Amino acid sequence: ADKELKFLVVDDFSTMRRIVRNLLKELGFNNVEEAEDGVDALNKLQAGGFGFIISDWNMPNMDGLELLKTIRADSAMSALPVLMVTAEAKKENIIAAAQAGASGYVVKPFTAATLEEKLNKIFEKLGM
């Protein structure tokens, strides 16, 4: 994984975005942009050059599942890695995301070490 991979962090909580950005920083990933909800994220993804999306499951207007399905359906972004974030792991949520193409799932709060492990797992799973 290129340390310069461009990340999109999506969460309706500013503070949760700041945590994720700070965690990534710690790992050496400084290339991060932020979005507030699914539609905000799609707007930004339009400009191109993103490499990895970290999205919250629970967001207004367009939730994580919807954003993920829209990414998967788009010819230009369909392969982008998507890491889903939830405050509470639920079997049907996990199955629904997997089936929709999520690259992985992480329960918050999480440390830099957990994030790293999730990141490496996906890079490994996707041969990146």
Considering only residues 36, 37, 40, 56, which one is a binding residue for Mg ion as defined by CB under 5 A?
56
31 versus 58: smaller Cβ distance to Mg ion? 58
Give the interface segment with Mg ion, choosing from 31-39, 51-59, 85-93, 98-106 (CB under 5 A): 51-59
Considering only residues 19, 34, 58, 86, which one is a binding residue for Mg ion as defined by CB under 5 A?
58
Considering only residues 1, 6, 12, 19, which one is a binding residue for Mg ion as defined by CB under 5 A?
12
DSSP 92-123: HHHHHHHHTT-SEEEESS--HHHHHHHHHHHH
Contact 20, 30 (CB under 8 A): no
From 56, 34, 26, select the one nearest 116 (Cα to Cα). Answer: 26
